């Protein structure tokens, strides 16, 4: 049985990592009903968008949502993890970020307080994540210049 | 139209709405949305993961 | 299948249709399914009158 959207937000990181598809779905099934415009097709043409800037304003909100999706898919793309929800990398874990052991992290902490504890070094980790790939780019570069 | 046993049946030039004029030229066209996602069995499995 | 329809002229008319497109071969007669004094008969000619 599945706890529902964001159900494991108070669960251990391992339990939420088991239901990450659940959190992944609310990125799409909020935006499937709005792009549908099936219940919007007939109601006063296109919900009277003439002299109603809330209609455009509403539309701009829909744009922000798909724009955020594109930000996350871009990050998964430049880290070579586009197709997968869980991917391992080559970046070693610098201990200065967090000193907690594996058992304490995955069976004693929630993703919220973890993201709060590591929000300080997120940019650095992303930099290593954008950098580390670059050594794969370079190995492919060796295969390119023969 | 009038059930008079085929006696009455008179056709007058109505002054119908303009949408009927659009229907007169849109009779051949139709709008559809593409659902490009199909799933089918071919008895092949991705055993290996990653 | 087409990306865009053919050129449709927005001819404002009420009794007779003007400057439209002609059905090929025989003329065409269009009513709804019920056909009993309730709809509006649409006629598309094969030869245009001037």
């Amino acid at each position: 049985v599945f706890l529902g959207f964001l159900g494991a937000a108070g669960s251990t990181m391992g339990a939420a990592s088991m239901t990450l598809t659940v959190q992944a779905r609310n990125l799409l099934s909020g935006i499937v009903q709005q792009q549908s415009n099936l219940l919007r097709a007939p109601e006063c043409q296109q919900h009277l968008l003439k002299d109603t800037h809330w209609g455009i304003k509403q539309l701009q909100a829909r744009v922000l949502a798909v724009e955020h999706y594109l930000r996350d898919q871009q990050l998964l793309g430049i880290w070579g993890c586009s197709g997968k929800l869980i991917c391992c990398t080559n970046v070693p874990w610098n201990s200065s970020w967090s000193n907690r052991n594996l058992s304490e992290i995955w069976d004693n902490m929630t993703w919220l307080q973890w993201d709060k504890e590591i929000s300080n070094y997120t940019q650095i980790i992303y930099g290593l994540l954008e950098e580390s790939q670059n050594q794969q780019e370079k190995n492919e570069q060796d295969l390119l210049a023969l | 139209g009038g059930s008079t046993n085929s006696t009455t049946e008179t056709f007058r030039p109505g002054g119908g709405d303009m949408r009927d004029n659009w229907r007169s030229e849109l009779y051949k066209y139709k709008v559809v949305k593409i659902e490009p996602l199909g799933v089918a069995p071919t008895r092949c499995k991705r055993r290996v993961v990653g | 299948t087409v990306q865009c329809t053919h050129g449709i002229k927005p001819v404002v008319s009420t009794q007779l249709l003007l400057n439209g497109s002609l059905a090929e071969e025989e003329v065409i007669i269009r009513s709804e399914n019920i056909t009993n004094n309730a709809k509006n008969i649409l006629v598309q000619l094969n030869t245009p009158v001037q």
Partner: antibody, heavy 129, light 108 residues
């Protein structure tokens, strides 16, 4: 809509012409796919649909009184009228104006009423010299 | 043209009874029929403007069924403000017809 004000002469002599007026308040007139009908009811007997005028223009009346009935529609005046020539004592009845919307598309913001949901107050027209 | 008939012509029922009224049409109307209530003296108030679709301001104790040439209005639990004369009307093209009517008073 809810205010269909009727007016006219409740007293008509024989062989004359009966003209009646039905004014609409809620401006549902300008909305398309609306049919505005005139209906009379003889006492004790049933109700008889006289004629209807469409959103484009008055198409049909009742075949019995087809040549002696003319329904007009003054767009901007917000009203629509009925005319009945050669008034006889058999036409002495109670007259109403009623509205109903039929949509071939079923394609609107809300659901419409196929039946006659809007009715006037009724005019009692009597005929005698 | 199309003619309509109601059964019974005069009916006298009690409060709370499941009452039915039959409206027979001469020709197939394709689910196009309306039921109306008229207290004597007032304009006919609309009840059901399709085969089964109820209008608003109307309590839930009313219902209409049927197809083809036979249609039935039904009241599960009658009330006090349900007297008067009831009519049926088809809107299947021009011209429009009305039923004879069903005088419904309270039983005695």
């Amino acid at each position: 809509q809810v205010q269909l004000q009727e007016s006219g002469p409740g007293r008509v002599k024989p062989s004359e012409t009966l003209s009646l007026t039905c004014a609409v308040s809620d401006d549902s007139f300008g909305s398309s796919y609306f049919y505005w009908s005139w209906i009379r009811q003889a006492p004790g007997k049933g109700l008889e649909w006289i004629g209807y005028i469409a959103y484009s223009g008055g198409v049909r009346y009742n075949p019995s009184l087809s040549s002696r009935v003319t329904i007009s529609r003054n767009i901007h005046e917000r009203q629509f009228y009925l005319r009945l020539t050669s008034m006889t004592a058999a036409d002495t009845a109670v007259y109403y104006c009623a509205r109903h919307c039929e949509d071939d598309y079923g394609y609107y913001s809300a659901a419409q009423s196929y039946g006659l949901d809007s009715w006037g107050q009724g005019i009692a027209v009597t005929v005698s010299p | 043209d199309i003619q309509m008939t109601q059964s019974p012509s005069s009916l006298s029922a009690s409060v709370g009874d499941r009452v039915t009224i039959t409206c027979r049409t001469s020709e197939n109307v394709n689910n196009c029929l309306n039921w109306y209530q008229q207290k004597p003296g007032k304009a006919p108030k609309l009840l059901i403007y399709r085969t089964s679709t109820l209008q608003r301001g109307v309590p839930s104790r009313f219902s209409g069924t049927g197809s083809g040439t036979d249609y039935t209005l039904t009241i599960s639990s009658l009330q006090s403000e349900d007297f008067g004369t009831y009519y049926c009307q088809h809107y299947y093209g021009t011209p429009l017809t009305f039923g004879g009517g069903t005088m419904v008073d309270i039983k005695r």
